[PDB]
Amino acid sequence: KETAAAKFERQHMDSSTSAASSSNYCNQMMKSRNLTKDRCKPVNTFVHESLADVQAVCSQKNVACKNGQTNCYQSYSTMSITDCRETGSSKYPNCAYKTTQANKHIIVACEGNPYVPVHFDASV
Numbered sequence: 533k534e535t536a537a538a539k540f541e542r543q544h545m546d547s548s549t550s551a552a553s554s555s556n557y558c559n560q561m562m563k564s565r566n567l568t569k570d571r572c573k574p575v576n577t578f579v580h581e582s583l584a585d586v587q588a589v590c591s592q593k594n595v596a597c598k599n600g601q602t603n604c605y606q607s608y609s610t611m612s613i614t615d616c617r618e619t620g621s622s623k624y625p626n627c628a629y630k631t632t633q634a635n636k637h638i639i640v641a642c643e644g645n646p647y648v649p650v651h652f653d654a655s656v
């Protein structure tokens with residue numbers, strides 16, 4: 533099956549673009565990363581940094597995860613991100629999203645050997 537770390541890259545990494553310029557970015561990216569295949573994933577964040585930079589967050593600031601697990605980490609630096617949020621008009625299979633660009637600290641959960649991001653928890 534798909535590994536958790538690979539799923540995290542597919543759902544949350546987009547180092548190919550410095551930031552969402554396009555109003556259409558989320559519509560396209562939610563679809564192409566398979567986040568709209570079986571339903572419209574309601575909220576999803578893409579991070580525009582190198583994979584090394586995001587993996588490094590697993591050795592940065594240890595914080596509580598929203599679900600109460602203790603294995604979340606907050607980036608010391610802000611990073612460029614895009615939040616995709618489903619619209620109220622959106623109806624599967626024609627999922628529609630608002631594309632919001634920001635620079636924020638990311639919070640990810642890390643697991644494994646190697647210790648790598650497996651879940652996007654929040655941005656702050």
Ligand SMILES: O=c1ccn([C@@H]2O[C@H](COP(=O)(O)OP(=O)(O)OP(=O)(O)OP(=O)(O)OP(=O)(O)OP(=O)(O)O)[C@@H](O)[C@H]2O)c(=O)[nH]1
Binds near residue numbers: 654
């Ligand atoms: O920034 C984000 C937040 C989430 N995600 C993805 O979504 C999945 C489900 O994670 P979830 O936290 O349960 O989703 P959401 O409650 O709607 O998050 P939220 O940003 O909407 O905000 P919250 O978690 O804090 O809940 P809330 O909507 O504020 O509730 P309330 O204030 O009215 O009481 C995660 O695994 C991530 O893959 C993301 O990519 N970027």
